Ligand binder design. Structure first.
Ligand code: ATP
Ligand code: MG
Length: 664
């Protein structure tokens, strides 16, 4: 029932994905690599003192601050949702092997008893209404490009000058390329305009993942992570096997001479995909104005900033349900890509642009190195894009695709289980749009706050409130899936975008507060995803440009966690035991150094200006810009800080492009 075509690097089809230059060639061939990260400047993740510190700290904090999560997954008391053993990894050393990406999720979705299209006409209207609302009255903005990002297939350029040239040219030739694809001339669109080819698969690490301590044995147990072998990936699970990867870190002593303390493991590795920049540029040109619209007009549902910004919305609710989605991106339905495209066409969007958009979501995938002596294979034929990989992480609009799917999925779940009396308001397209526009503004008795897979669903006083409690009960029971579209459950310790919803004795949203997650502080400070990259001179290009700055925003971010002071004192005590130094002092020096270094990057900042003008968001982002990709958006960051991390193509170029795409 269709195995995906697979080509070795040797094959012309794979060869054609990599330009005749060194970076691109090296990317094609890059062998499985592993090794300790430079956690902080001059400190390795596998430093014995550092692992001793992690052993003492994880044990102490779990001991003294056991999880306070009720029967309904509501966090109370100390604001703790699990043990602190997730820090116990040999950062920079992955679990083996990493998964081969599934070329088609069709069987997987079907076997999970998920819908192959909208179930009812109402759902069809709602998904189409989401498209109408999201893509309608768009205002052109400059095409902003993250500094240090790669152009991936085929050039693998990291130079901003080159990236701007690529982007400008892509906006000029997108029409020509889209038209070629309409004529089924994919190789021509790729050859001429580098629009097509494949996604480039990279494996990134999830630095902290589940670990438990067996009381019987006193031995630690790492969470098993299932991986697909090559056969399973190409057949969409029809053949091949799905098995647990190995997180055993014993191998590091024999291979590298690294002493592995007991209860320390290899890191979980997640697949990431980098899009062909020329194809992403025209998509992003539309996706950015879409974000602006939804974060402004539909700010209630979509625009999330501080813990208090969230609290203001949730306090008004009589019931708050924090939901959880089962591997969201991989399960994302291709029928939705087709629906979206169909509706954009009906809206009057340029068919050539829609084709580029459609194509971006059917593209082949080049697998790098999932394990030693494995990989270097192209899955799918770029001559006729037809993969069903779910949602690709490097697609120009992924966040919008996940947000669109999920927002409607949760609304449908609220309609089906709690608000049948609202069904009458969704009769046709104009009524579906009117209803959704109101729902998204927080104007109905059923409400939600979401960002892709993360969400909190609300009920005010009314007819639906009782249904809301029955739904919550269904979720607690966990025997029936409340959605036909995705596998939904309730979150064990409800949190929204890294803020824990801290309930009191009343267990009511009105009495509840959003607090920073202290575990996420520990994740960020001791288990960074990347090393310091002290090699990379231009700090704005690094994965962690100014690590030291995080110390300055810490109290604002984490200060409201009940155990904040206790944790910081525990850190100090444990760091003294391990290094014979003050952690606080160490961080203050790093903060001073990074504050001084920052002034070199900020035009407004005098030779020693001081963090005066900077917000806590600005600081958290400069220490970790990945937070700008999942927790915040561009508009949440100060003007001067934005310019450190991004650069844009003029609004004059985009404005002309946008006019040619959009209806009338
Ligand atoms: N630097 C980070 N620290 C913690 N969580 C992150 C970080 N970066 C991304 N995440 C998000 O956390 C995920 C794990 O699943 P889920 O969406 O419940 O997040 P989480 O445990 O709520 O994250 P956080 O630790 O910020 O609360 C990934 O899907 C990822 O997008
Ligand atoms: Mg969360």
């Amino acid at each position: 029932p269709r195995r995906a075509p697979a080509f070795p690097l040797s094959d012309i089809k794979a060869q054609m994905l990599f330009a005749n230059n060194i970076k691109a060639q090296q990317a094609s061939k890059r062998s499985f690599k592993e090794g300790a990260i430079e956690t902080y400047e001059g400190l390795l993740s596998v430093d014995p003192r550092f692992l001793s510190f992690k052993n003492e700290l994880s044990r102490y904090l779990t001991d003294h601050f056991p999880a306070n999560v009720d029967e309904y997954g509501r966090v109370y008391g100390n604001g703790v949702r699990t043990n602190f053993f997730g820090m116990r990894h040999m950062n920079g050393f992955p679990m083996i092997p990493a998964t081969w990406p599934l070329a088609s999720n069709l069987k997987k979705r079907a076997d999970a008893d998920l819908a192959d299209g909208p179930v009812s006409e109402r759902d069809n209207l709602l998904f189409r209404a989401a498209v109408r609302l999201m893509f309608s009255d768009l205002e052109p903005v400059p095409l902003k490009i993250r500094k240090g990002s790669s152009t991936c297939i085929p050039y693998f350029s990291n130079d901003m000058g080159t990236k701007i040239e690529i982007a400008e040219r892509a906006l000029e030739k997108a029409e020509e390329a889209g038209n070629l694809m309409l004529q089924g001339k994919f190789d021509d669109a790729y050859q001429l305009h580098q629009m097509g080819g494949a996604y480039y698969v990279v494996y990134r690490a999830q630095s902290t993942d589940a670990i438990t301590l067996d009381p019987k044995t006193g031995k630690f147990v790492s969470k098993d992570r299932m991986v697909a072998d090559f056969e399973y990936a190409v057949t969409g699970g029809e053949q091949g096997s799905l098995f647990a990867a190995s997180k055993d870190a014993s191998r590091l002593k024999e291979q590298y001479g690294i002493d592995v303390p007991d209860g320390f493991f290899c890191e979980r590795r997640r697949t990431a995909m980098g899009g062909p920049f020329a194809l992403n540029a025209p998509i992003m040109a539309v996706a950015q104005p879409v974000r602006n619209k939804i974060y402004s007009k539909y700010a209630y549902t979509f625009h999330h900033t501080t813990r208090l910004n969230k609290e203001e919305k949730v306090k008004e609710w009589s019931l708050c349900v924090a939901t959880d989605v089962s591997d969201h991106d991989t399960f994302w339905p291709g029928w939705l890509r087709d629906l979206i495209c169909d509706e954009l066409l009906n809206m009057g969007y340029a068919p050539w642009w829609v084709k580029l958009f459609e194509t971006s979501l059917k593209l082949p995938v080049y697998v790098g190195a999932p394990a030693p002596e494995q990989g270097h294979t192209l899955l799918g034929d770029p001559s006729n894009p037809d993969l069903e990989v779910g949602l690709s992480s490097g697609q120009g609009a992924t966040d919008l695709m996940g947000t669109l799917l999920m927002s409607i999925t949760y609304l449908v779940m609220q309609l089906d289980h709690t608000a049948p009396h609202l069904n009458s308001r969704i009769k046709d397209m104009p009524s579906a749009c009117r209803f959704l526009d109101s729902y998204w503004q927080g104007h109905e008795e059923i409400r939600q706050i979401s960002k892709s897979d993360d969400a909190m669903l609300g009920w005010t006083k009314g007819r639906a409130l009782v249904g809301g409690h029955r739904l919550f009960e269904m979720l607690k029971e966990g025997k029936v899936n409340p959605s036909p579209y995705m596998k939904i459950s309730y979150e064990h310790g409800g949190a929204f975008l890294g803020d824990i919803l801290l309930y009191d004795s009343r267990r009511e949203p009105g009495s509840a507060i959003f607090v920073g997650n202290i575990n996420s502080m520990l994740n960020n400070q001791f288990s960074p995803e990347y090393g310091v990259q002290s090699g990379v001179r231009d700090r704005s290009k690094r994965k962690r440009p100014f690590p030291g700055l995080a110390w300055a925003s810490m109290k604002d971010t984490y200060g409201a966690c009940p155990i904040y002071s206790d944790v910081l004192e525990a850190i100090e005590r444990c760091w003294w035991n391990a290094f014979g130094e003050s952690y606080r002092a160490y961080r203050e020096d790093m903060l001073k150094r990074d504050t001084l270094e920052l002034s070199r990057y900020v035009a407004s900042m005098a030779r020693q200006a001081g963090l005066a003008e900077l917000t806590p968001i600005d600081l958290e982002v400069l220490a970790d810009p990945n937070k700008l990709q999942y927790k915040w958006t561009e508009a949440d960051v100060s003007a001067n800080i934005h310019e450190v991390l991004m650069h844009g193509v003029s609004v004059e170029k985009t404005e002309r492009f946008l006019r040619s795409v959009m209806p009338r």
